[PDB]
Ligand SMILES: *[C@@H]1C[C@H](O)[C@@H](CO)O1
Ligand SMILES: *[C@@H]1C[C@H](O)[C@@H](CO)O1
Ligand SMILES: *[C@@H]1C[C@H](O)[C@@H](CO)O1
């Protein structure tokens with residue numbers, strides 16, 4: 026069984042975001058086409074462990090910001106597949122940017138929406154950058170070795 | 183003065199967004215390095231003139247969505263400079279995506295933040311995609327013929 | 340009127356191709372948004388003036404081939420807009436390649452089909468690389484300063 | 497033995513094209529450096545099985561066209577190697593475009609010509625996009641783990 | 654005459670480099686196809702005016718380094734043409750990098766070699782990234798509106 | 811254990827360069843995350859074995875130069891990781907170009923400096939293209955499956 030690495034695109038700034046984050050991670054551990062251990066998770070790769078909620082002294086540090094930004098870009102460009110855990114009502118600008126970078130780097134762009142939200146309107150540009158969009162409960166079984174283009178079964182705004 | 187064209191990146195979904203939108207457009211009309219008439223303004227380039235507010239049934243039409251998405255991408259790639267009118271508390275996933283695409287296409291990426299909000303925290307990826315971020319009051323006199331790199335003087339998360 | 344330069348993509352291997360070629364050139368001379376003199380016309384940019392029809396031995400010369408190929412690529416990348424004069428029944432692999440390169444370089448890609456052939460089936464990949472496809476009779480008045488996305492009103496296979 | 501995936505670039509619109517197609521597929525199944533099962537074959541990935549010869553009702557359907565186009569691009573960008581089954585006398589515009597896209601995505605571009613046609617003139621732009629060109633009878637044994645640049649032993653026009 | 658902007662790629666670390674630098678700048682001022690005032694000259698775009706010769710402590714400052722590096726990249730991407738003043742015996746790794754970036758951004762890449770050195774051996778990768786290489790004495794009259802592909806008439810290693 | 815391929819970027823034109831070259835190769839053979847046998851080594855892939863020191867007749871051969879240049883670019887684009895064996899006092903223009911190409915192709919860019927030179931100033935553009943820089947003695951143990959962004963512990967000029 027060949028295995029692909031991913032970039033774990035996800036907000037971590039609300040309760041719905043954090044719930045979906047946790048669900049998506051568990052789904053990935055059970056997916057036999059994913060090498061999760063060699064994958065890139067932003068929250069585990071911030072420069073010196075820093076997040077502006079846990080060590081707010083880095084809110085204005087340009088060195089931390091430069092290295093973390095670069096590391097995230099690096100995590101996209103050196104992994105096979107771009108994943109975007111996506112809350113339709115709580116969309117994230119950072120993920121948006123990362124989606125656009127992933128497109129520029131030739132990566133398959135897969136959005137994953139919680140089952141309870143799948144169908145709800147998403148930003149047109151998110152719909153368009155994405156190659157496919159699936160429900161959280163499909164993620165454990167998604168075959169990342171044969172990723173195909175498909176349309177969201179749901180609305181845009 | 184040589185003149186450069188832009189893509190008018192800006193949300194239109196809140197009061198703050200619409201205020202900044204109107205301000206940014208007024209600033210641009212007074213900027214002598216901008217050819218606004220040959221610039222691309224999303225809201226004036228809705229596909230086949232059809233207004234999504236008057237006929238919301240087109241938010242399930244994949245052809246409308248495809249053409250509009252492509253027209254936005256086309257508006258970025260065929261113009262000199264990428265402008266992102268940016269509200270720190272009302273960050274937009276669609277703009278984020280567009281910023282990422284603008285980077286991929288080799289464009290100068292300029293964010294403009296209302297003076298009342300300049301300094302407030304912005305997403306790391308926004309900070310990073312940007313080549314510069316300025317206050318609304320600097321936009322009238324920004325020299326688009328000699329755009330340079332600088333950092334936001336403000337917070338990032 | 341600001342003016343844009345183009346790369347003159349067109350086959351030259353049949354009667355229909357040569358007719359459309361001549362028509363497209365005439366249309367361009369009357370279009371006030373085109374700087375034709377600073378545009379790149381393959382047939383006027385043969386390497387070191389050497390004419391492949393008069394000396395066919397250069398079709399086994401790798402240096403001639405390298406320089407010409409590079410000059411065409413250079414002609415696409417250094418001009419504003421990619422033009423593809425396109426005959427639906429006499430589709431050209433070389434043009435196809437050039438279209439793909441033009442996309443890669445961030446150029447507006449415009450196909451122009453003779454009015455007598457507009458509507459006839461075209462290759463899916465041609466339909467897709469295009470940002471727009473118009474009839475020969477619309478080329479004189481096409482506004483290259485505000486190029487927009489639209490679909491071919493015609494068949495694809 | 498490491499294995500690479502490919503995008504199966506080939507016309508399917510003439511008898512020579514179909515013969516070469518079949519030959520190339522059989523060659524690939526016997527090549528131990530190719531993971532054919534995880535590879536992308538256009539004809540097996542058209543949106544809902546549709547081809548305009550078998551279900552001509554999709555000749556004018558923009559949804560089918562959008563998804564199929566995107567799927568083909570996706571098949572190139574997510575696989576290791578770009579293959580072009582190529583008939584010198586029956587060159588294909590769609591393949592041309594795909595070659596150009598493959599170049600833009602950093603892929604090794606290998607043309608394969610039937611032994612009976614190898615040596616015959618090919619379009620200059622095809623010669624140039626390609627990194628290498630081989631005969632059908634070399635394909636079963638080609639080492640895709642060590643792909644190198646080499647010149648066609650044959651003419652261009 | 655339409656005018657094009659450039660990025661002034663040139664070492665500044667030896668006598669030969671500084672001589673060629675000064676010569677190339679003088680040549681450019683007399684070239685009527687160049688808008689030198691809206692061009693990007695590294696040495697006139699040092700971050701926040703701070704002079705690295707007067708305050709060498711900034712060569713350990715990551716913020717100074719980041720901003721300057723980005724400003725150079727920005728200077729390449731936002732200008733029409735990439736110029737590389739090139740001394741064959743004093744080749745520069747930084748220029749090499751910039752050449753590679755200019756290629757990636759779709760720019761015409763022109764090397765200019767002092768007449769006294771034209772013909773001397775240059776690095777293969779320099780020969781290859783270049784779209785053309787000319788002598789210092791040809792720079793005043795180079796037509797930047799119709800830049801074409803040609804080979805160095807000289808040695809490569 | 812997954813394994814990555816590399817492009818062996820290194821000068822071979824001085825004694826320090828050759829020493830570092832040899833050291834880096836030995837380090838790579840002992841690294842269990844590297845598939846060295848499927849990696850690309852310039853010196854083993856020059857067109858027909860030619861190097862202008864061993865067969866100087868190719869100093870002016872454009873065919874040899876074209877194919878070798880293309881082969882090197884191909885070696886970067888088809889391998890996972892870009893390596894640059896780097897002497898701070900003897901920087902190489904060819905490597906510089908290759909670094910810039912590697913960036914354009916989305917590759918992790920790792921510089922390796924001899925332990926005896928680690929800390930010494932490097933060109934700003936080299937510092938900036940690189941994602942990370944390590945000492946020769948770290949190379950045998952570097953985990954290429956989880957490559958991350960980090961700053962050189964050393965100066966730039
Ligand atoms: C980059 C990492 C994560 O996916 C988002 C947070 O906004 O940006
Ligand atoms: C595209 C246009 C505008 O800037 C945003 C809206 O979300 O995306
Ligand atoms: C390059 C120029 C022209 O448009 C075609 C001929 O096949 O390719």
Ligand SMILES: *[C@@H]1C[C@H](O)[C@@H](CO)O1
Nearest residue numbers: 505506507538590591
């Ligand atoms: C895309 C698939 C196939 O290789 C060709 C047919 O023209 O286009």
Ligand SMILES: *[C@@H]1C[C@H](O)[C@@H](CO)O1
Nearest residue numbers: 662663664695747748
């Ligand atoms: C960037 C500017 C100049 O052309 C060189 C110096 O090494 O790199």
Ligand SMILES: *[C@@H]1C[C@H](O)[C@@H](CO)O1
Nearest residue numbers: 819820821852904905
């Ligand atoms: C390309 C191969 C090697 O890394 C350098 C020599 O200058 O250029």
